[PDB]
């Protein structure tokens, strides 16, 4: 559910301070620039099951750093991915069992904490058609509000023994040019080429190229960053800014409809579609233009308030599946929300007692009921949340992703211009009925 408490919400045009009126109503602009999104080709949640159980003992924290993942996403230079949960668990156990082997009086002492750096969190299952070069080659990248640059996996292969599959070969483009870089970046390089997204042409687009078969290491064909221009882009016009500069009649906004079980998922450039949501679109101001990052005031699990006594922020990250909470909040969470047997028809009765999760931004309230944050895995119901600490800043980051948040809320990302700041819009998604 989404609603504003207090005074009835008003159009954002009627605001006094555009930076302070959380929960105002967005002017809806219908757009015809639709980009269908499809399932990326495995939907296996055993990785998240193991991740939860590895937190049972209370001494394990997963973390990522701001900007250090592929394309400027959250990550580290480690080799750990979430797909590596059995290697990770084996190492955790080895490390723990080697340490247990190796007027008022209070006594300071040290406990062992095991940190698991994650390489990146890029694991959305929804990809869209991108056309690259001349004559055009089709790739299916993730469209990622949590990334800044464009990256494409190259799979060029001229030998006769190469498997016959759809490949992206930058040298088959008449218009591809390789750029000169003085940074030794599985290998990375930078080039430029022409792209087509939907009906929009985007020339002179700088992008990174990943070469080695290579999909043993990588789980996406590409990343189109929809973040902000800044140090993380390094003078290279990001894709969406480049689109806007070359297609001047497009309003600087894009929206996302995630409908996993209908095949109707969609990215919309330059506007929204009234058929994707119910009610109004409620606006949150972006506090730090880097990720799409919004100040978080409180967070409730039922009656229990778990946040926020310190500075907290929610990142809307379309390129990641799960929601996240920091390590202290997930202690409470995993005590309050249990995985259970669900079958598939017993599920509405099982979850009848689970608690509502309530995010509070000013007077704007976003609820996730249990059939909105629980997912099915074999015959087991599971909460679609990961424990992720973002230590980079003294503040605490929460992530809202595609499997839980966006499947239930229609989301609008509005770039701030000369007559508006950057904002995220949210509306109840169209009810599948």
**Residue numbers annotated as active site:** 144, 317
CA 320/CA 368 separation, integer angstroms: 18
Query: Is the Cβ of residue 259 or residue 328 nearer to its own copies in the bound state?
Result: 328
Is 237 among the residues that bind ligand NAG (CB under 6 A)?
A: yes
Is 236 among the residues that bind ligand NAG (CB under 6 A)?
A: yes
Minimum CB distance to ligand NAG, residue 233 (Å): 9
Minimum CB distance to its own copies, residue 28 (Å): 42
Is 241 among the residues that bind ligand NAG (CB under 6 A)?
A: no
Query: Is the Cβ of residue 81 or residue 149 nearer to ligand NAG in the bound state?
Result: 149
Q: What 8-state DSSP symbol labels residue 87?
A: H
Tell me if 239 sits within 8 A of 205, measured CB to CB. yes
Peptide bond into 308 cis (omega under 30): yes
Tell me if 390 sits within 8 A of 396, measured CB to CB. yes
Query: Is the Cβ of residue 3 or residue 114 nearer to its own copies in the bound state?
Result: 114
240 burial (CB, 10 Å; 0-12 / 13-18 / 19+) is: buried
From its own copies, ligand NAG, none, interface partner of 114 (C-beta below 5 to 8 A by class): its own copies
Task: For residue 253, give the nearest of 55, 18, 27 by alpha carbon.
Answer: 27
The window from 113-121, 231-239, 299-307, 414-422 that contacts ligand NAG (CB under 6 A) reads 231-239
Is 206 among the residues that bind ligand NAG (CB under 6 A)?
A: yes
Q: Where are the beta strands (DSSP E) in 226-276?
A: 253-257, 266-269
* Phi-psi domain of 56 (left: phi exceeds 0; alpha: psi -120 through 50; beta: other): alpha
End-to-end CA distance of the chain: 17
Interacting residue with its own copies among 196, 214, 336, 380 (CB under 8 A): 336
Peptide bond into 135 cis (omega under 30): yes
Main-chain dihedrals φ then ψ at residue 46, nearest 5 degrees: -60, -30
From its own copies, ligand NAG, none, interface partner of 237 (C-beta below 5 to 8 A by class): ligand NAG
Minimum CB distance to its own copies, residue 59 (Å): 9
Binding mask 87-126 for its own copies (x = CB under 8 A): xx-xxx--x---x---xxxxxxxxxxxxxxx---------
Query: Is the Cβ of residue 196 or residue 380 nearer to ligand NAG in the bound state?
Result: 196
Is 204 among the residues that bind ligand NAG (CB under 6 A)?
A: yes
CA 156/CA 176 separation, integer angstroms: 14
Tell me if 355 sits within 8 A of 337, measured CB to CB. yes
From its own copies, ligand NAG, none, interface partner of 230 (C-beta below 5 to 8 A by class): none
CA 334/CA 1 separation, integer angstroms: 23
Size of interface with ligand NAG, in residues (CB under 6 A): 5
Is 356 among the residues that bind ligand NAG (CB under 6 A)?
A: no
Query: Is the Cβ of residue 202 or residue 384 nearer to ligand NAG in the bound state?
Result: 202
Q: Which residues bind its own copies (CB under 8 A)?
A: 58, 78-80, 84, 87-88, 90-92, 95, 99, 103-117, 303-304, 328, 331-332, 335-336, 338
């Amino acid at each position: 559910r989404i609603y504003k408490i207090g005074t009835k919400a008003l159009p954002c045009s009627e605001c006094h301070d555009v930076f302070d009126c959380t929960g105002c109503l967005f002017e809806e602009k219908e757009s015809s620039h639709v980009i269908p999104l499809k399932l990326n080709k495995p939907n296996d949640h055993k990785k998240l099951q193991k991740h939860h159980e590895s937190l049972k003992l209370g001494d394990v924290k997963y973390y990522v750093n701001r900007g250090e993942g592929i394309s400027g996403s959250l990550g580290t230079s480690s080799g750990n991915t979430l797909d590596d949960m059995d290697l990770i668990n084996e190492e955790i156990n080895k490390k723990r069992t080697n340490a247990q082997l190796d007027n008022a009086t209070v006594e300071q002492t040290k406990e062992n904490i095991f940190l698991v750096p994650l390489k990146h969190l890029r694991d959305s299952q929804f990809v869209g058609e991108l056309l690259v070069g001349t004559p055009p080659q089709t790739v299916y990248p993730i469209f990622d509000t949590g990334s800044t640059n464009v990256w494409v996996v190259t799979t060029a292969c001229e030998e006769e023994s190469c498997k016959k599959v759809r490949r992206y070969d930058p040298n088959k483009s008449k218009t591809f040019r390789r750029s000169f870089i003085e940074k030794n970046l599985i290998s990375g390089s930078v080039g430029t080429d022409t792209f087509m997204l939907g009906k929009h042409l985007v020339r002179n687009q700088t992008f990174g190229l990943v070469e080695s078969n290579i999909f043993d290491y990588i789980s996406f064909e590409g990343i189109v960053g929809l973040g902000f221009p800044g140090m993380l882009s390094a003078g290279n016009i990001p894709f969406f800014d480049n689109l806007l500069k070359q297609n001047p009649n497009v309003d600087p906004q894009f929206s996302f409809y995630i409908s996993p079980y209908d095949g109707k998922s969609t990215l919309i450039i330059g506007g929204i579609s009234k058929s994707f949501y119910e009610g109004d679109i409620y606006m949150l101001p972006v506090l730090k233009e880097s990720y799409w990052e919004v100040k978080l005031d409180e967070l409730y699990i039922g009656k229990e308030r778990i946040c926020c006594d310190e500075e907290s922020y929610v990142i809307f990250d379309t390129g990641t599946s799960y929601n996240t909470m920091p390590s202290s909040q997930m202690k409470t969470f995993l005590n309050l929300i249990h995985s259970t047997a669900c079958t598939e028809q017993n599920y509405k009765d099982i979850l009848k007692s689970y608690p509502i999760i309530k995010y509070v931004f000013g007077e704007l309230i976003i609820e996730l009921h249990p059939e909105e944050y629980m997912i099915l895995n074999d015959d087991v119901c599971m909460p679609a949340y990961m424990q992720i600490d973002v230590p980079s800043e003294r503040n605490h980051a929460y992530l809202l992703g595609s499997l839980s948040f966006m499947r239930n809320f229609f989301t609008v990302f509005v770039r701030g211009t000369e007559s508006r700041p950057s904002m995220v819009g949210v509306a109840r998604a169209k009810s599948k009925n």
